[PDB]
Design an enzyme around this catalytic site. Structure first.
Site, mmCIF file in Angstrom:
data_model
loop_
_atom_site.group_PDB
_atom_site.id
_atom_site.type_symbol
_atom_site.label_atom_id
_atom_site.label_comp_id
_atom_site.label_asym_id
_atom_site.label_seq_id
_atom_site.Cartn_x
_atom_site.Cartn_y
_atom_site.Cartn_z
ATOM 1 N N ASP A 97 -6.821 8.811 8.875
ATOM 2 C CA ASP A 97 -5.631 8.154 9.403
ATOM 3 C C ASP A 97 -5.420 8.429 10.888
ATOM 4 O O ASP A 97 -5.861 9.450 11.408
ATOM 5 C CB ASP A 97 -4.394 8.598 8.612
ATOM 6 C CG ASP A 97 -4.360 8.014 7.206
ATOM 7 O OD1 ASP A 97 -4.254 6.781 7.081
ATOM 8 O OD2 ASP A 97 -4.440 8.780 6.230
ATOM 9 N N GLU A 130 0.898 -1.148 0.000
ATOM 10 C CA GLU A 130 0.000 0.000 0.000
ATOM 11 C C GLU A 130 0.941 1.203 0.000
ATOM 12 O O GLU A 130 1.743 1.377 0.926
ATOM 13 C CB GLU A 130 -0.886 0.056 1.244
ATOM 14 C CG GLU A 130 -1.805 -1.130 1.444
ATOM 15 C CD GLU A 130 -2.870 -0.846 2.492
ATOM 16 O OE1 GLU A 130 -2.568 -0.116 3.459
ATOM 17 O OE2 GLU A 130 -4.003 -1.356 2.352
#
Length: 253
Positions: A60, A49
């Site tokens: 996040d 990723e």
């Protein structure tokens, strides 16, 4: 279909679960991040990723948000992200690359162009953490045009109807978060199994071999990010490779 499907078919024959490693381009700096990427690939990462620094990473956690900020202050651009993908693609021909990007940048750059460039530089698919439902159909259509794998996101609280929409939306794989934002996500995956045959990876809260073994017992793979980013922050490349090697140990049968 592409590298994603091939990889899971390969892992199945090897009796392994996939280790998905997440690192940010440009953190703590471009050079160091490149070494980090190479290290996790050399030590067993099955799916990569690639983090595309964004100015407002609301999805996040604290650690990754720092990576975003620092990378942006280092001047990391979409062009630098794809240069890194192209560089790694030459050394690891069959490892699936998933670009982690928020939606806004795609729109700002232009859907067609964004997808065109991503495909040309080795990207296999996207993971869009904040994809607005009202923009989904258009993005999926363009991604289909450029043969970029769409990876839908699920949650421990996804309804049965949502699960079916997730399966039909996924080209080769799906990603579920492990917490309501264990027993809960495990049961949800079992439901998913009833309605979907596509591989599923589970993330959030993975940092120990035990975690990989436990999650890998019911998922087709596990996603590790914050734990890797932390080590990269202090340029602890050797320890990073050791951690990836250990996590992958808990993914073998």
């Amino acid at each position: 279909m592409g590298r994603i499907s091939d990889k899971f078919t390969e892992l199945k024959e090897k009796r392994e679960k996939a280790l998905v490693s997440y690192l940010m381009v440009g953190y703590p700096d471009y050079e160091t991040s490149l070494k980090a990427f190479k290290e996790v690939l050399k030590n067993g990462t099955d799916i990569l990723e690639i983090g595309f620094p964004f100015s407002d990473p609301v999805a996040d956690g604290p650690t990754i948000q720092v990576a975003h900020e620092v990378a942006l202050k280092n001047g990391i651009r979409f062009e630098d992200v794809l240069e890194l993908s192209e560089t790694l693609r030459k050394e690891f021909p069959d490892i699936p690359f998933l670009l982690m990007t928020y939606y806004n940048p795609i729109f700002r750059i232009g859907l067609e162009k964004f997808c065109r460039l991503s495909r040309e530089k080795g990207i296999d698919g996207f993971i869009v953490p904040d994809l607005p439902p009202e923009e989904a159909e258009e993005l999926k259509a363009v991604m289909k045009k450029y043969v970029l794998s769409f990876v839908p996101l699920g949650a421990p609280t996804s309804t049965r109807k949502r699960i079916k929409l997730i399966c039909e939306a996924a080209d080769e794989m799906t990603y579920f978060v492990s917490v309501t934002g264990y027993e809960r996500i495990k049961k949800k995956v079992e439901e998913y199994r009833e309605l979907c045959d596509k591989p599923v990876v589970v993330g959030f809260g993975v940092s120990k071999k035990e975690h990989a073994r436990e999650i890998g017992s019911f998922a087709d793979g596990v996603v590790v990010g914050s734990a890797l980013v932390k080590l990269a922050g202090q340029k602890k490349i050797e320890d990073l490779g050791n951690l990836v090697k250990e996590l992958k140990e808990g993914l073998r049968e």
